[PDB]
Design an enzyme around this catalytic site. Structure first.
Site, short mmCIF file in Angstrom:
data_model
loop_
_atom_site.label_atom_id
_atom_site.label_comp_id
_atom_site.label_asym_id
_atom_site.label_seq_id
_atom_site.Cartn_x
_atom_site.Cartn_y
_atom_site.Cartn_z
CB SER A 22 -11.87 10.13 -1.72
OG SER A 22 -11.63 9.08 -2.62
CG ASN A 80 -8.80 7.29 -4.45
OD1 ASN A 80 -7.83 6.27 -4.67
ND2 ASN A 80 -9.17 7.37 -3.09
CG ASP A 95 -14.14 9.00 -5.08
OD1 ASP A 95 -12.93 9.21 -5.05
OD2 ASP A 95 -14.80 8.26 -4.31
CG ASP A 99 -6.61 5.60 -0.86
OD1 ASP A 99 -7.73 6.19 -0.44
OD2 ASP A 99 -6.21 4.68 -1.78
CD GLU A 130 -3.32 -0.51 0.12
OE1 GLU A 130 -3.14 0.55 -0.56
OE2 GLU A 130 -4.11 -1.30 -0.14
CG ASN A 132 -11.00 6.24 0.25
OD1 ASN A 132 -11.08 7.51 0.29
ND2 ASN A 132 -11.34 5.66 -0.93
CG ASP A 192 -16.44 -2.69 7.35
OD1 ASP A 192 -16.17 -3.70 6.73
OD2 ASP A 192 -16.25 -1.81 6.38
#
Ligand code: CL
Length: 129
Positions: free
Chosen positions: A50, A46, A48, A52, A35, A59, A101
């Site tokens: 956003s 990213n 969209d 990281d 990562e 994110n 989650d």
């Protein structure tokens, strides 16, 4: 800060990640490698809009606030900049909520594509733990 492999393993173990939700230490070290290349200051944007952040590339669309991702949530209730610190505590505590989650470590694309189903124990081989 750019961690060494065994240095990060020992840090993660101390913060309770070994076998957390059934994921052995090697899984976490492998994910961090691909990562962020073990660099706490890593950022990537990213499509969209956003971004990281940090050693586990968390994110801003869902997990932290950076003030420039409209209509996003802040489920770990932290500024995204807190995830870039040389102290990995904030990153680890947020990662624990993500992995709980329902989707486990599949939330991390690099883990799914480069760690899952491999011999991850090799990532902690030789370390003093
Ligand atoms: Cl799982």
């Amino acid at each position: 800060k750019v961690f060494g492999r065994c240095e990060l393993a020992a840090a993660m173990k101390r913060h309770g990640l070994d076998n957390y939700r059934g994921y052995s230490l090697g899984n976490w070290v492998c994910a961090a490698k691909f990562e962020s290349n073990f660099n706490t200051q890593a950022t990537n944007r990213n499509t969209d809009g956003s971004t990281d952040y940090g050693i586990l590339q968390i994110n801003s669309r869902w997990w932290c606030n950076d003030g420039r991702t409209p209509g996003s949530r802040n489920l770990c209730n932290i500024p995204c900049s807190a995830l870039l610190s040389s102290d990995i505590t904030a990153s680890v505590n947020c990662a624990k909520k993500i992995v709980s989650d329902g989707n486990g470590m599949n939330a991390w694309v690099a883990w799914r594509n480069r760690c899952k189903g491999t011999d991850v124990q090799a990532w902690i081989r030789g370390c003093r733990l």
